[PDB]
Design a protein around this ligand. Structure first.
Ligand SMILES: CCCCCCCCCCCC(=O)SCCNC(=O)CCNC(=O)[C@H](O)C(C)(C)COP(=O)(O)OP(=O)(O)OC[C@H]1O[C@@H](n2cnc3c(N)ncnc32)[C@H](O)[C@@H]1OP(=O)(O)O
Lengths: 187, 189
């Protein structure tokens, strides 16, 4: 709808200056819409950011929930999550910036709302790790919470370094290397 | 410089308590017990306080760790000490941890370039640990240094973040060894 049109404009505006500096005024402009229509779909500036994450990352998470079920091993499931996460971000310069730089919010209730959306992603990781242990693919005795932190932390920092380097190298081509590092470690 | 450091300390406190954007020079000045003009005698602006805060703390963090890792032989041992020192510093200072994990995470891409340039000193240590390990035959052949470093930092960093998200209520430092072992051996059986 026009709902998606403002969401898409929001991605552009927030990426340009950062969320705090971004203005609702300029979001309407890039959307090609008037200020009042923004308040027809959204409560405020904060609601736009949450909805952005819900729509962009939330839909990614749901797709992953389905698509990993096709894959036999925990390794392969993880291979797809990383690969698809890199692809999503590499297909949109502004999306990469927003998802990385605005994931960790200072304001508590805004942070809670975004964390809640990202929990679905962490849930997937925990589920891959648990099933992996039960089948014997993954280290028995593995602290699932810690391993999920490592996996997510590694994915996130790989994307963040790329964003800091103005996305000037091929993120997607790194996914298998990232997988192997997570699977085998450095020794 | 004593007044310089007192301002840094006050800034950590105020920025952690109020958030960086809701933090203002005048409130940091009040917290430090100096006049507003005294802040500017040392800093360009609020932005410069945040950058210098990071530059300062990172400097002291390395100086402890850099002299300490030299005694340790293997890459694994050096990493062990990197993780525990990283965890120890942030567990010892509640407010500093909020700053590193949240308040320094500014989305103004430009400002974030100046912050990350300070991080480079630390990431370089990780790189050196890996390349020493490569040369001695300790590290897995086929490893990419840049990516492994991103793994190591991202993993340590996410562990601190999750801890901060949970109000720093559990013993972060005690997870050091397990995080090390995950990074060294991976998730596989
Ligand atoms: C006080 C308490 C302490 C405790 C620790 C402190 C924690 C508090 C930190 C809070 C601030 C954060 O947000 S930290 C959490 C999020 N993470 C980050 O912000 C860090 C992300 N990384 C970066 O910012 C950047 O990598 C820098 C600026 C830090 C490092 O830049 P650099 O020195 O150029 O190194 P690097 O990025 O490797 O770039 C070198 C060249 O290699 C390329 N390159 C980089 N990675 C890769 C790769 N995986 N595969 C291929 N190529 C790559 C780059 O494009 C670049 O191209 P060319 O153009 O050079 O050819």
């Amino acid at each position: 709808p026009k709902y998606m049109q403002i969401i898409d404009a929001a991605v552009e505006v927030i990426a340009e200056n950062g969320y705090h500096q971004s203005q609702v005024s300029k979001i309407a402009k890039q959307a090609g819409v008037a200020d009042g229509t923004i308040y027809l779909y959204f409560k405020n500036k904060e609601d736009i950011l949450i909805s952005l994450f819900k729509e962009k990352m939330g839909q990614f998470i749901e797709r992953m929930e389905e698509d990993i079920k096709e894959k036999a091993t925990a390794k392969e499931k993880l291979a797809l999550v990383i690969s698809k996460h890199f692809s999503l971000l590499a297909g949109d310069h502004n999306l990469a910036i927003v998802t990385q730089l605005e994931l960790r919010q200072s304001n508590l209730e805004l942070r809670q709302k975004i964390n809640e959306i990202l929990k679905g992603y962490l849930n997937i990781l925990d589920g891959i790790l648990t099933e992996g242990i039960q089948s014997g693919e993954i280290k028995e005795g593995l602290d699932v919470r810690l391993a999920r932190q490592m996996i997510f932390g590694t994915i996130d920092e790989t994307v963040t370094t790329w964003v800091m380097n103005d996305q000037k190298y091929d993120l997607v081509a790194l996914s298998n290397s990232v997988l192997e590092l997570l699977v085998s470690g450095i020794h």
